[PDB]
Amino acid sequence: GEDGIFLVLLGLLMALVSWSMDYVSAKSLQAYKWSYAQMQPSLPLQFLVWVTFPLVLILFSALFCHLISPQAVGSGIPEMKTILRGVVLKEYLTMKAFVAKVVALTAGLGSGIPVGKEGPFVHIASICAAVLSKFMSVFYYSDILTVGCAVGVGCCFGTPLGGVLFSIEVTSTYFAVRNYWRGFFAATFSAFVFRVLAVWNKDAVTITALFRTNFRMDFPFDLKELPAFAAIGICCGLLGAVFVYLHRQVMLGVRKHKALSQFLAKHRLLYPGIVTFVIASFTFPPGMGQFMAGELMPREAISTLFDNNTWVKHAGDPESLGQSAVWIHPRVNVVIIIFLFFVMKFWMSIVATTMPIPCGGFMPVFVLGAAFGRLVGEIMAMLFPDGILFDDIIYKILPGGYAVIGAAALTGAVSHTVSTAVICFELTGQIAHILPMMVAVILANMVAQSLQPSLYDSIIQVKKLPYLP
Amino acid sequence: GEDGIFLVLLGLLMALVSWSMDYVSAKSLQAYKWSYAQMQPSLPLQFLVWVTFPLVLILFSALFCHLISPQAVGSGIPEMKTILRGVVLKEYLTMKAFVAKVVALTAGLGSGIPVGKEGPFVHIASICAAVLSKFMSVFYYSDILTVGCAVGVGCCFGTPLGGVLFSIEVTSTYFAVRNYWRGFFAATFSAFVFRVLAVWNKDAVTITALFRTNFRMDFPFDLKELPAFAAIGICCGLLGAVFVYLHRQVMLGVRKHKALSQFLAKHRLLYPGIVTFVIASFTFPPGMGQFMAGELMPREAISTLFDNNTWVKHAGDPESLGQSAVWIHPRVNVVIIIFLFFVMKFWMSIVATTMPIPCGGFMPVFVLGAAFGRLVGEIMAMLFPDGILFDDIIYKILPGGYAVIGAAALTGAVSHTVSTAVICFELTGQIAHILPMMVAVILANMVAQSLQPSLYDSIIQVKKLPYLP
């Protein structure tokens, strides 16, 4: 009927918005790197620019989520999964919030602070679905929200079927397969237009997925290492649980005492600002980024962590690798700097997503999972030096695969879902490690579902929304 | 709770059954090839053995679906998708049919006649689910059938998430996500045990998917060829529709007249037997297999059609390729033999799946799709000789990708579903062509949903089961 025209118009209007915002964010971020390099090597000057650019940009984003729309702070998927369980929120789906959010999500992304991308984008995709429906036939409600969620995540990442699985498996109890067909149609069209546009205007020469990895697909892994994958199941789930626990121990920590509540009511934007300050103090590269690999914005950080070469063995030479040359210090072994990167981005991510900013809880958790995966992969490669044999040719293990297993498993354990593995392999561009990441996702899910509740369940519990089951 | 023990026991019991039956079928089929080669080149003797082995084995399978269980003929998914819409069939889920079906599906598969594998396997997986539940807690119903369907197709092909999508998207109207989690768990465990067992006992050296393809993943296809994919959408959908139409024009063709009904009631097993005969008459390789590539059992036939080299250009030399050397005739161009293979397996497949045998409608449709795909790929490679340029290196197109697009799209158009692309790329082992196969699956679905009904809908219409919507 007249469903196809509405769905194709939603897809073509969502791809341009996603492409525009990350185009602008990428140009702002490379201008940041450019100016920071190109002034001079002056260590106080480097500190002051490396601090004053993210404070300006994050306080700008907090200003445009405070001023225009007072209801879009703390946004993302948990209040809309509260909405589709029956509760209506009338003023919350206003078009005026839309322009109030997108520009904030630009200025949440153009800095190197770990935030999400998915959550506010799911919200604005639902906004565009509702507005385009209300404009339609003036010249069904949970259907509109489910199609909005599918188009939102499948237009974030160019991952259609991971989009429709992410819409069904957490934001529902029953599900009409009419929405399955509609969400699959609109999500694959949005992911189609978003990827071909980066060949038209910019240069990404073909319809490569987003983050390709050149693994070898000829004996990737034997079953002599397979219980190691069991470890990267279980520990990730355990680590995922601790994340959720500590998240609540900051949320209530904002609201536990009258003193800091009076301090925040004295001036609202002071809480993001200074804490932006302190994580800039641990990201300055000659300050502590030597011990940290601090000079990595997160997109190229996880393009780096999915590399196809062993970092312990290429440390005997000063050979120029890609960006991964920042992962070599002349005094410290690389296992220690992966360890410190993991622990400091781990406590940095919770306090980064705590602040009153449009936040998603997917991307920094994905980065933490990749870091833990490559940690256990590098100690596997250090433990078994020779590799094993094949027809007069030697195959040695490679730790990019461990990184992609961990970057599926830990965010699957945090967000209490099994469909994270789908967008994981659909971002990485290869499915060589597919059933080990499914087994690891399921082990991490059963451990992190035994111990603690989900992330979004804790958010709706602390924010105290009407949530009946 | 006590769900995990039941699901892991179902998975480990289903993997052994699938592995055992295709182990036995593969050994029988290679013994067929072995004896046929190893007697002598005597052209009447070759004819008589090439005919008398499939007649014996197919009449044996028809005997063991006629004798023990009189209710398991015409089995597969459409009567069970009738069952889960409300209608009960009491005597149909008896354990006695289980042993009556599995051995038949061995002797439906050990011959080279095109049959399915999925349908009767979904049925026996539901049988094992129900029996293991009734044995459980003596020392929920649609849940048991949906878990049975997911384990069935994900244990056929080692494809978990394509399994759970194949269970939701056609055999439901609503869907409880409890069954999503259970089906995902049990399907990935079944696909895990099935693939690692082929390294323990037999040799498939690692957890390679099933049918790997070595494409190049470095500029697979430009967007200068992309409307060709539009053609392999639309035509496949049109061709898929014709398949369904002709299928009904044989089913009613059995039941249109009293004469052939009296002829069949005279002797029931005569109808499969002789028609097995006639397709053997068009598969004898010096008879007509020169013009046909007849000496290809279907599994190695579609391992051949997914090859990474151009068949027009490697015809100037008598170089030994793999099995694909059967695709070269010294007098006939290869486009004509792909064309004749397609048209003769097209009319052969409907009459092959017509006969009273446990049949699935997935595998021969998959083969027909691969043949049409490589047809349009070879004429694309014949049309554009030079390829195009890159950094002083030339990239020419390769027609394996067209074959895998067509083998997704035409069976997606026949079975009226979008989740065929998932098991397509999960069998082929690479996701380089993923969003073109999604776009082609959706174009073929909208054309073949405009023209004719589904395959299984026509089956339940002609068999006249109680089907309310």
Residue numbers in the entry:
A (entry chain A), B (entry chain B): 115 to 253, 262 to 591
Sentences from the paper on this structure:
For structural characterization, sample in the presence of 100 mM Cl− at pH 7.5 and in the absence of nucleotides or antibodies was initially employed. Three-dimensional (3D) classification of particles resulted in several different groups, of which one yielded a 3.6 Å overall resolution density map for the transmembrane domain, allowing confident model building. The final model represents the membrane-spanning portion (note that the N terminus and intracellular αA helix are lacking) as well as parts of two C terminal’s so-called cystathionine-β-synthase (CBS) domains present per monomer (for which some cryo-EM density is left unmodeled) and includes several features that were not observed in the ClC-K structure. In CLC transporters, the Cl− conducting pore is marked by distinct Cl− binding sites (denoted sext, scen, and sint, respectively, but no Cl− ions are resolved in the current structure), and the constricting Glu232 (of αF, also known as GluGATE; ClC-1 numbering throughout) and Tyr578 (of αR, TyrC). Unfortunately, the GluGATE side chain is not visible in our cryo-EM density maps, but carboxylate groups of interacting acidic residues are known to be frequently undetectable using cryo-EM due to radiation damage. The pore aperture of the extracellular vestibule is constricted by a hydrophobic barrier with Met485 (Met427 in ClC-K), but in contrast to ClC-K, the gate opening is also controlled by Lys231 (of αE–F) and Arg421 (of αL) that may orchestrate Cl− permeation to or from the extracellular environment. This difference can be attributed to αE–F, with its GluGATE and Lys231 adopting a more CLC-transporter–like configuration because this loop is considerably shorter than in ClC-K, alongside a side-chain reorientation of Arg421.
